[PDB]
């Protein structure tokens, strides 16, 4: 749509993927503020909104905090405590049309400027004149809305820019929406660190031939220690043992006899650290 | 007010080399970052580089390992230089300037008048 009419897209029951957003050829422009633009898909946030529409080149600049000017006084203002990403892509190969296009309208004079996050459905004709311009449309009552006229041979920042700009909001509820969260492969029989959907730890895993039901994730046993843990991806159940720690004790004939001395590692079956279990 | 000439452009040759420069003037060149960008006749623009006010540099996939770009803080100049150019690289290089301070990412608020390289053997 033009801007004078920005669609305020909800996306929601839903991943976001921001890595492979940002690293795309046409998004000229990704600006975030607040946050990291990287780092984002660790952060979760509840509801994204989306403010997306299509301004001129030498306009993409207005779109930030406290900024004045055209597009910010009149069609689209950003709050001065704004938080997301303005995304902004030439789109000159499908929007403009040959002889100009006069479909993406902005508009030019208002009797107050907006207030953040504001929109202008109604268009009347203007009246800036003293006089009461009794519904007329003439000098001193121009029509608010003036068209881009994009051409494809205009200059090399006339041309039309598709932005959606992101705002994420926070509600009384815990994030829902959230990045990718990769994984890694999964070891058995070496004890790893370890976080199983949150679950923290380090132990050495192993098959576990105890059945779960489906519902529950992991497993307790007295004293509330987790010992096995569901696999999110494959589904199976892996048992969980902390991997040898012991004492070693030295053992000494006297220094007086001799400085020869042998080594007890405890409780550790030893094929792993003349050698007797 | 802001203006922005870039210099460099022209005929390539088969893993030929070239040097763009970017002089920025009528605002402060060491705390904006600068940017470069390029279009094919007949596609949308897509940016190849990009450069941040800490030193920092940011390189488009497709030409990765082979775009180079800096700053001249001497004379508060920018350089993309093409090493190994291939010849499907054919399209109209523009320097772009951040368009505020405050956030995080690439700004392209700004255009200049871009230099077209195509290839000639």
């Known amino acids: 749509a033009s801007v004078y009419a920005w669609n305020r897209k909800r996306i929601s029951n839903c991943v976001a993927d921001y890595s492979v957003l940002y690293n795309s050829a046409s998004f000229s422009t990704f600006k975030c503020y607040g946050v990291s633009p990287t780092k984002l898909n660790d952060l979760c946030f509840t509801n994204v909104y989306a403010d997306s529409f299509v301004i001129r080149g030498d306009e993409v600049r207005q779109i930030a905090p406290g900024q004045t000017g055209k597009i910010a006084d009149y069609n689209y203002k950003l709050p001065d405590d704004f938080t997301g990403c303005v995304i902004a892509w030439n789109s000159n190969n499908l929007d403009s049309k040959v002889g100009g296009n006069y479909n993406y309208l902005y508009r030019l004079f208002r009797k107050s400027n907006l207030k953040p996050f504001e929109r202008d459905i109604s268009t009347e004709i203007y009246q800036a004149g003293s006089t009461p311009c009794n519904g007329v449309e003439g000098f001193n009552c121009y029509f608010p809305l003036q068209s881009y006229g994009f051409q494809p041979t205009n200059g090399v920042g006339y041309q039309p820019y598709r932005v959606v700009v992101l705002s994420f909001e926070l509600l009384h509820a815990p994030a829902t929406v959230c990045g990718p969260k990769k994984s890694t492969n999964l070891v058995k029989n070496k004890c790893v660190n370890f976080n199983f959907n949150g679950l923290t730890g380090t132990g050495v895993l192993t098959e576990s031939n105890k059945k779960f039901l489906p519902f529950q994730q992991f497993g307790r046993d007295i004293a509330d220690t987790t010992d096995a843990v569901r696999d999110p991806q494959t589904l199976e159940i892996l048992d969980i043992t902390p991997c040898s720690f012991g004492g070693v004790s030295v053992i000494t004939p006297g220094t007086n006899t001799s400085n020869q001395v042998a080594v007890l590692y405890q409780d550790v079956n030893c094929t792993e650290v003349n050698v007797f279990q | 007010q802001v203006q922005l000439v870039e210099t460099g452009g022209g005929l390539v040759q088969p893993g030929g080399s070239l040097r763009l420069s970017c002089a920025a003037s009528?605002?402060?060149?060491?705390?904006?970052?600068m940017g470069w960008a390029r279009q094919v006749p007949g596609k949308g623009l897509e940016w190849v580089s990009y450069?941040?006010?800490?030193?920092?540099?940011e390189y488009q996939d497709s030409v990765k390992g082979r775009f180079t770009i800096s700053r001249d803080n001497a004379k508060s100049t920018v350089y993309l230089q093409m090493n190994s150019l291939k010849p499907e690289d054919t399209a109209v290089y523009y320097c772009?300037?951040?368009?505020?301070?405050?956030?995080?990412?690439?700004?392209?608020?700004?255009w200049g008048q871009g230099t077209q390289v195509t290839v000639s053997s």
């Open positions: 450069i941040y006010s800490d030193g920092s540099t």
């Open positions: 009528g605002f402060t060149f060491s705390s904006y970052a």
């Open positions: 772009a300037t951040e368009g505020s301070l405050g956030g995080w990412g690439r700004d392209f608020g700004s």
